[PDB]
From a paper:
VLRs are featured with a LRR domain of multiple LRR modules and an invariant stalk region rich in threonine and proline residues2. Jawless vertebrate AIS employs VLRs as antigen receptors to recognize invaded pathogens, such as viruses and bacteria. In summary, we identified Bf66946 from B. floridae as an analog of variable lymphocyte receptor VLRC using bioinformatics analysis and structural comparison combined with in vitro bacterial binding assays. This is the first characterized VLR-like protein in amphioxus, suggesting the emergence of VLR-based AIS in basal chordates.
We applied both the recombinant Bf66946 and Bf289081 to crystallization trials; however, only the crystal structure of Bf66946 was successfully determined at a resolution of 1.79 Å in the space group P212121. Each asymmetric unit contains two molecules with a total buried interface area of 567 Å2, which is not sufficient to maintain a stable dimer. In fact, gel-filtration chromatography also indicated that Bf66946 exists as a monomer in solution. The overall structure of Bf66946 (residues Cys21–Asp202) adopts a crescent-shaped solenoid conformation, rich of conserved leucine and isoleucine residues involved in formation of the hydrophobic core, which is typical for the LRR family. The structure contains a 36-residue LRRNT, an 18-residue LRR1, two 24-residue LRRVs (LRRV1 and LRRVe), a 20-residue CP and a 51-residue LRRCT. The inner concave surface of Bf66946 is formed by a β-sheet made up of six β-strands (β1, β2, β3, β5, β7 and β8), with β1 anti-parallel to the remaining β-strands that are arranged in a parallel fashion. Notably, the 20-residue CP in Bf66946 folds into an α-helix that shares no identity with the 13-residue CP of previously identified VLRs. Moreover, the N- and C-terminal caps of Bf66946 also have four strictly conserved disulfide bonds presumably important for the structural integrity: two within LRRNT (Cys21-Cys27, Cys25-Cys39) and the other two within LRRCT (Cys146-Cys171, Cys148-Cys192). Altogether, lamprey VLRA and VLRB possess an insertion in LRRCT, whereas Bf66946 and lamprey VLRC possess a protruding loop in LRRNT, suggesting that Bf66946 is more likely a putative VLRC rather than either VLRA or VLRB. Thus, we identified that the residues Asp105 and Asp107 at the concave are key to recognition of Gram-positive bacteria.
Numbering used by the authors: 21 to 194
Amino acid sequence: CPSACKCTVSLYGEMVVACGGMGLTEIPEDIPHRAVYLVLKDNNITKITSYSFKGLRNLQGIDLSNNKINHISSAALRHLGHLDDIDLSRNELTSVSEKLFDFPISSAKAQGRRFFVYLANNPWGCDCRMAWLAQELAGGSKTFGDRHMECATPAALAGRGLSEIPQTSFVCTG
């Protein structure tokens, strides 16, 4: 168990790794392979990389709410086939890639279960890189929650809900 965390096994035999509110600037090393719930809420994390969850393929819940995350590698979740919930709410993300969620979505579908992504309260940049999520939300996706999903930029779209903006308003210049 990492020194900044508490690792406890539940009555159901599931290991919770609780590292909330510890001032962490990075994901801790040596989280045990048996980790099922990883709580990293209320820290100072800025980046999720391709290797942030290396060796943590049993994770069912990841709580990264209320950090300072401004980028997540599109490869970060590519081996997380048991993920039920990921919380990236209250961070500094301006975009997320569609490819980021492919594996947990596919795995959840194959396993007959729900995989939920909670992205509330990020400063979304509503250019052509976020049209995909805008449209999934507009369509009624069961994967991506639509609470507090609003554009920070560009100026014309500031304050508008992603799911209420037409596709042709999501524009990229050079």
